[PDB]
């Protein structure tokens, strides 16, 4: 006589010990995960052999921690079903008894879809008996895939609503957070080994291919509501785009590589991680938007979590972008470029005028920060070049409505209109280059 196992693969974004009854839980209202490949193994003999020296709990635990020690994982006979769009994968018609004992079955996620981490290898020992004193013939399991994620969480230390695209100003500090799971078997030894651990690399690589950000700081590493970073530092390996090391191995203009087990004392780290095994880690860091952040340029990041050199779990973060504007100061009635025309940048703030002060500083302004004052004389005086198509450029601005105010015409000219109202368009230089005419004398 036989038994069926129907699996319900589901997404996990937090810590959650919830027990498998084996009973059908119906509409649980949880996101299913598709494309998880599961293999099943009869471990009844191996289990009962352990059961001579160890209790029931310890036996099942030993098999979970090193399933490939007790079975040939790449067995062609081993029944394999892949999880569908509802997260469903049924293994049917399995022997209820094996060599005179109630059967023990082990389940192993062999291929885990991106960007998930695999479920722990689960062990079921029959029977699973109903409260009416009768065995279940269909056993329902809810294995969990932990979702690797990356978000932009704060801008200038204020929480922002999460979205795929953010508008930034030059000199903004951006807080990012990468989340992932400490493996359930982090502290286990390699299958058939007394002298080598199973895990020898727990790496987080995060970078941007395009320019725009300068690495500021790694702010925290937390798990289980505890700050782990103070304990780790020294014992693990760390590189940032600010370190001369970085340009040796990578050529991304921004990023960091962290390895919990690449440091001076791996084993001490593995110990600490084992204490929080199966739980969710948040690695937080900050970056500063720099003068090389340009308009018409969306720039994102990729984070890669890897446990060996040959594999990785990859996730993309949101893209950021910035505004700019171009002007052309010229002689009324022609296209003669007028250099040395003097302007200040204005905006309204609840029916009050503020004027721009640029920290970084031709006609091309590319500041490192823009602050705002109601003292008009403190405003940065902007000068035009003699360039052809546009002779005043500004970038790193938020989108919205501004006013360019001309405070001195070039020698030999007089101002037509002192004020030019305009609009910075999100992530672009704008509709067109704005022409400003000055009349000669």
Numbering used by the authors: 37 to 397, 401 to 480
Give me lines lifted from the publication on this model:
So-called major pilins polymerize head-to-tail into the pilus backbone, with ancillary pilins added at the tip (adhesin) and base (anchor). The L. rhamnosus GG genome also carries the genes for another pilus operon called spaFED9. The tertiary organization of GG-SpaD is a tandem assembly of three Ig-like domains, wherein a middle domain (M-domain) joins together the N- and C-terminal regions (N- and C-domains) of the pilin subunit.
To study the effect of lysine and catalytic glutamate or aspartate on isopeptide bond formation and structural stability, alanine-substituted mutants were prepared. X-ray diffraction data were collected for two mutant proteins (D242A in the M-domain and K365A in the C-domain), and though no isopeptide bonds were present in each, their overall tertiary structures remain unchanged. In the C-domain structure, the observation of continuous electron density between Lys365 and Asn477 confirms that a cis isopeptide bond is present and located in the first (A) and last (G) β-strands of the CnaB fold. Catalytic Glu445 forms a hydrogen bond with the O moiety of the K–N isopeptide bond in a hydrophobic pocket.
